[PDB]
């Protein structure tokens, strides 16, 4: 028997939950607003069913707003036209509402807009959307062709703004590498160590994280928000803390074990990775930076 | 090289009962939970069922079924009580599998909305149709909401099956209407046989009404 | 290496309105519609063919921007009444730079031995007369193909407070539908004659009218 010894790293601006109940299936902390973390939660109305990418991005945006809260109010007075997305005469989004509802798991304006206006035909098509790309579209306004899944190329030929986004266009421009706030990383083929190490650095550098994973089917995988991680004395992940849009609103932050499974893959489970509990393999990571180097200018 | 994969949500689907099954106490309505695109490598799918958060143990779970696309489909079927469904109770499928980080939950209940009572009217054949061998008996159902309805025909207590019913059409006042057509040999109609249009719907007393149609009152 | 595209432009190709094809006063048009046209590759080139022979009279609609940041791009070819009815094939060929090759769709009229609609007008139920508004019914059955137009009139004026069911497939492979005109009971009780008008290929002059009145 050895002493317990755990290093815990949490996202810039996020208070770790304090009360964690063990449930029949998961260990979880219920959602309490204004602790800096977010739980956009799907209702499964036919439109949001496969929109976990836009939800994970949504939660990352709602954080982003909290981090950049004073610079953002200043930007919206300086550029009042970026307080709304117009499609000619109709109003599609009010940036003021996004801010006043961001605490709502089921009825944030930001997810309503994603579900209803920006990406309503994705679930029918049985595809979803890459979080990074939702972010690059919402902040910088980079056009998002939902059939193209590669990361944003700043040097690309089509440099015009997406009419669905571009809110912070005048600071976070297009065409400049330095103003792209997003990253994406592949974790297939990589080690516990390698994966542990990248999650530690990204958290430590002050990014918000999303983690994708296998979802017990051959065709369509899941993505969630990765808010904090626990590492062992050897510096490998033992555990992570997540919100998940398929999980109903009463669950909130969930602890997942991390560890190598029977089949030699890094995997995550509400229960301990051992025996027959083979968990879901972890697949990649998405990253959002605050952009404060740029905001300061 | 990095490679993306599709990210979205579940391969788990939860289906309501057939509307007509919920409205006829002769029939048994079932809520159905379906898991698709299951790999041959994956482990067992387990189902747990809940009604207003209370576990129930009468679900019928098929073994997994190989498909032409070489995946497996697993289905579980829970029979429900007519009045529970109509009173708006919530049915919850929990899908457990070791390859999922945690179990997946879906919940379904009836959509609520202000019911409206069907008006049911039977309309005899046109005089002009009597030059044909078979004639058309019509049942107009209008004024009703929601659109889930069942219409059947009977004659002297015997079921009449040579009919077709139109889909519901949205009427100008936001209610629905449909017509049903029973085709009968002119001879049988002229015998003075009493035919009956039965309509099953939420907003009728006893969920049921019957209107008669006959040559001579 | 780029990931491969998970979709692209779709083409939907739509027949003329039944009534337009049956009245030489009207001009029937076949309409070719392209959705999921990207803003990176928004130009669509359209080429039209009739029984494989190219025709050059298409009209080019201006592109329509959509809330989902794609375009709906349309081309509209007017056709000849009797070409459509004699069963000629219209082919829209769509070129766009997102696709290495054109998409071709072809439309023609449904095939099958045409069949004459039987039209029958059915008065309101005696039971319905307790209401302020009553229901006039037109049953149209026995007809093929399903392309048909149904209207209502009275005393020289069009009546527009009606709803018509979509065609439904009958057991013999023909089609049937009902149309419901709603009128204030007072109008019916006065003895006014309302008229159900049907346009279809298998009627003489492509038209018939059946009358309905209290008496
Ligand atoms: C981005 O947005 C645009 C805009 O969409 C609109 O706004 C968004 C927010 C949503 O709310 C949309 O629902 C809304 O429409 C999206 O563009 C849409 O893309 C879809 C496909 O993804 C198209 O669906 C097709 O629609 C046709 C029917 O189209 C008519 O009816 C619609 C309403 O019922 C109407 O909205 C359309 O404008 C169109 O209206 C007709 O227009 C013509 C020309 O002007 C006119 O003459 C007509 O009178 C008029 N009709 C009416 C009723 O007004 C439908 O037929 C298609 O179904 C076939 O293909 C399917 C494959 O997607 C398949 O599953 C079906 O089973 C069916 O298959 C066919 O079946 C027949 C037998 O029945 C067979 O013979 C055929 O061979 C077979 N073909 C195939 C290919 O399988 C299909 O549902 C929408 O038309 C289109 N909307 C518009 C406005 O153009 C775009 O998708 C969005 N993109 C993203 C990324 O989200
Ligand atoms: C591998 O093969 C699997 C098997 O599919 C069947 O067999 C193959 C060989 C083919 O012949 C198929 O065409 C055939 O269906 C596939 O499973 C299917 O997965 C898809 C999704 O990937 C499912 O589509 C969904 O359909 C829902 C409606 O479901 C009814 O209608 C279906 C057809 O449209 C039908 O197949 C269903 O069984 C069901 O219909 C009833 O079936 C019974 C018999 O059980 C009949 O007696 C009844 O008369 C039928 N009708 C009724 C009312 O009772 C949709 O609701 C659903 O959309 C919803 O979710 C999406 C998001 O997820 C939202 O966007 C949307 O708004 C809505 O909320 C969806 O379209 C399909 O149902 C599955 N089939 C079966 C049998 O379950 C695999 O997908 C395939 N794998 C791959 C990788 O290709
Ligand atoms: Na959630």
DSSP for C10-69, written as a single string = EEEEE---HHHHH-TTS--EEEEEEEEE-SSS---EEEEEETTEEE---EEPPPEE-TTS
Q: Give the minimum alpha-carbon distance from C99 to chain A in angstroms, rounded to a whole number.
A: 13
CA atoms within 13 Å, Cβ hemisphere of C171: 10
Q: Is the dihedral of CA A23, A28, A31, A35 positive or negative?
A: positive
Q: Which fold has domain A7-295?
A: Cathepsin B; Chain A (3.90.70)
Angle between helical axes of A52-67 and A69-78 (0-180°, round to 10)? 90
* Residue entry with tokens 């209407």: B177
Q: C54-83: b or e for each residue (b if 16 or more CB lie within 10 Å)?
A: eeeebeeeebeeeebbbbebbbbbebebeb
Residue contact B7–A221, C-beta within 8 A? yes
Same fold flag, B12-108 and B119-213: yes
Least distant ligand from the CA of A38: 3
- Are the CB atoms for B59 and B49 separated by under 8 Å? yes
Contact list, C139 vs chain B (CB under 8 Å): 126, 136, 138, 179, 181
- Asked if C3 and A148 come within 8 Å (Cβ–Cβ), the reply is yes
Q: Is the domain C10-107 a CATH 3.90.1150.220 member? A: no
Report CA(A41)–ligand 3 centroid distance (Å): 4
Q: What's the rounded Cα separation, in Å, for the pair B7 and A213?
A: 8
Query: What is the residue-wise DSSP string for C151-208?
Result: EEEETTEEE--EEEPPPEE-TTS-EEEEEEEEEEHHHHHTT--EEEEEE-TTSGGG-E
Ligand nearest to the Cα of B73, by number:
2
Q: How far apart are CA A256 and CA A249, in angstroms?
A: 17
Q: Which residue of B has its CA nearest to C168?
A: B166
C-beta pairs of A189-194 under 8 Å, 24+ apart in sequence: A190/A266, A191/A266, A192/A236, A192/A237, A192/A258, A192/A259, A192/A260, A192/A266, A193/A235, A193/A236
Interatomic CA distance for residues B180 and A271, integer angstroms: 56
Q: How far apart are CA C163 and CA B142, in angstroms?
A: 12
**Nearest-CA distance from C76 to chain B in Å?**
30
The residues, ordered by sequence, that sit 6+ positions from A196 with a Cβ below 8 Å of its Cβ are A231, A235, A236, A237, A258
**Contact: A280, B36; criterion CB under 8 Å:** no
Closest CA to A76 of A296, A92, A68: A68
Distance A227 CA to ligand 3 centre (A): 13
Which residues form the pocket of ligand 2, taking CB atoms under 6 Å from any ligand atom?
Answer: A 46, 49-50, 123-124, 126, 219; B 18, 34, 36-37, 67-69, 71, 73
Q: What are phi and psi of A246, to 5 degrees?
A: -80, -20
How many angstroms is the resolution?
A: 2.3
- Strand order from edge to edge, sheet including C90-95: C53-55, C45-50, C90-95, C103-107
- Which chain B residues have a beta carbon less than 8 Å from that of C120? 125-126, 128-129, 136
Distance CA C118, CA C149 (A): 13
Structure token digits, residue B176: 């629905």
Task: Tell if the CB–CB gap between C163 and B171 is shorter than 8 Å.
Answer: yes
Which among C175, C176, C210 is the top mutation candidate for probing chain B, defined by the most B β-carbons within 10 Å of its own β-carbon? C176
How far is residue A283's CA from residue A126's CA, in Å, rounded to a whole number? Answer: 19
A chain contacts of residue B103, beta-carbon cutoff 8 Å: 25
* Residues of B whose CB is below 8 A from A115: none
Chain B residue with CA closest to A45: the answer is B108
Q: What SS3 class is residue B197?
A: strand
Domain definitions of chain A by residue range: 7-295
Q: Which ligand is nearest to the CA of B21?
A: 2
- Residues from chain A that touch C72, judged by Cβ atoms under 8 A, are none
| Ligand 3 is an ion; residues with CB less than 5 A from it | A 39, 41, 247
Sheet arrangement for strand B158-160: B158-160, B150-155, B195-200, B208-213
Location of structure tokens 């061998």? B133
Experimental technique behind these coordinates: X-ray
CB spacing of C180 vs B181 below 8 angstroms: no
Q: Domain residues of chain C, as ranges?
A: 10-107, 118-212
- Residues in a beta bridge with C76: C31, C59
Q: Which fold has domain B119-213?
A: Immunoglobulin-like (2.60.40)
Peptide bond into A215 cis (omega under 30): no
* Rounded Cα–Cα distance for residues A245 and A50 (Å): 10
CATH of domain C118-212: 2.60.40.10
A29 CB-near residues (< 8 Å, 6+ apart): A17, A18, A19, A20, A21, A252, A253
A249 touches chain B (CB under 8 A): no
Domain B12-108's class? mainly beta
Cα C209 from chain centre: 20
Strands (E) across chain B are located at 12-15, 30-38, 46-51, 54-56, 60-61, 65-66, 72-79, 91-96, 104-108, 119-123, 134-144, 150-155, 158-160, 163-165, 169-170, 176-185, 195-200, 208-213
Report d(CA A282, CA A273) in Å as an integer: 13
- Tokens 């009449």 found at: B160
């Amino acid at each position: 028997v050895t002493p317990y010894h755990v290093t815990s790293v949490w996202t810039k601006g996020v208070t770790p939950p304090a009360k964690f109940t063990q449930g029949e299936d998961v260990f979880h902390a219920p959602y309490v607003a204004n602790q800096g973390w977010y739980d956009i939660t799907k209702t499964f109305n036919g439109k949001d069913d496969l929109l976990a990418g836009a939800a994970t991005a949504g939660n990352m945006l709602h954080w982003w707003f909290d981090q950049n809260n004073e610079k953002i109010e200043a930007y919206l007075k300086k550029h009042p036209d970026k307080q709304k997305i117009m499609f000619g005469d109709q109003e599609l989004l009010d940036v003021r509402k996004v801010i006043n509802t961001k605490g709502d798991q089921t009825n944030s304006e930001l997810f309503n807009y994603f579900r209803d206006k920006a990406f309503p035909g994705l679930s029918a098509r049985r595809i979803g959307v890459m979080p990074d790309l939702v972010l690059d579209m919402f902040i910088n306004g980079y056009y998002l062709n939902v059939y193209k899944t590669q990361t944003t190329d700043v040097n690309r030929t089509y440099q015009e703004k997406d009419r669905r986004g571009g809110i912070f266009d005048a600071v976070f421009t297009r065409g400049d590498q330095s103003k792209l706030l997003t990253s994406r990383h592949d974790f297939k083929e990589k080690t516990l160590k390698e994966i542990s190490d990248l999650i530690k650095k990204e958290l430590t550098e002050g990014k918000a994280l999303g983690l994708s994973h296998t979802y017990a089917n051959v065709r369509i995988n899941h993505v969630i928000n990765l808010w904090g991680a626990d590492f062992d004395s050897n510096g490998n992940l033992e555990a992570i803390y997540v919100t998940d849009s398929d999980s109903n609103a009463s669950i909130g932050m969930k602890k997942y074990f991390v560890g190598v499974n029977s089949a030699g893959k890094v995997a995550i489970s509400a229960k301990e990775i051992k025996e027959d509990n083979i968990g879901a393999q972890v697949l990649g990571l998405f990253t959002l930076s605050t952009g404060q180097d740029s905001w300061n200018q | 090289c990095p490679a993306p994969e599709l990210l979205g949500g579940p391969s788990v689907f939860l289906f309501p009962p057939k509307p007509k099954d919920t409205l006829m106490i002769s029939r048994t309505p079932e809520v159905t939970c379906v898991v698709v695109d299951v790999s041959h490598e994956d482990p067992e799918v387990k189902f747990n069922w809940y009604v207003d958060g209370v576990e129930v143990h009468n679900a019928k779970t098929k073994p997994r079924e190989e498909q032409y696309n070489s995946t497996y489909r697993v289905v579980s079927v829970l029979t429900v009580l007519h009045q529970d469904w109509l009173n708006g109770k919530e049915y919850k499928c929990k899908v457990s599998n070791k390859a999922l980080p945690a179990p997946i939950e879906k919940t379904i209940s009836k959509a609520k909305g202000q019911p409206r009572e069907p008006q049911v009217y039977t309309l005899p054949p046109s005089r002009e149709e009597m030059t044909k061998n078979q004639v058309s008996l019509t049942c107009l159902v209008k004024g009703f909401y929601p659109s889930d309805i069942a219409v059947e025909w009977a004659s002297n207590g015997q079921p009449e099956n040579n009919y077709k019913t139109t889909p519901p059409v949205l009427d100008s006042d936001g209610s629905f209407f449909l017509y049903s057509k029973l085709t009968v040999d002119k001879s049988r109609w002229q015998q003075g046989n009493v035919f009956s249009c039965s309509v099953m719907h939420e907003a009728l007393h006893n969920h049921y009404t019957q209107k008669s149609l006959s040559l001579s009152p």
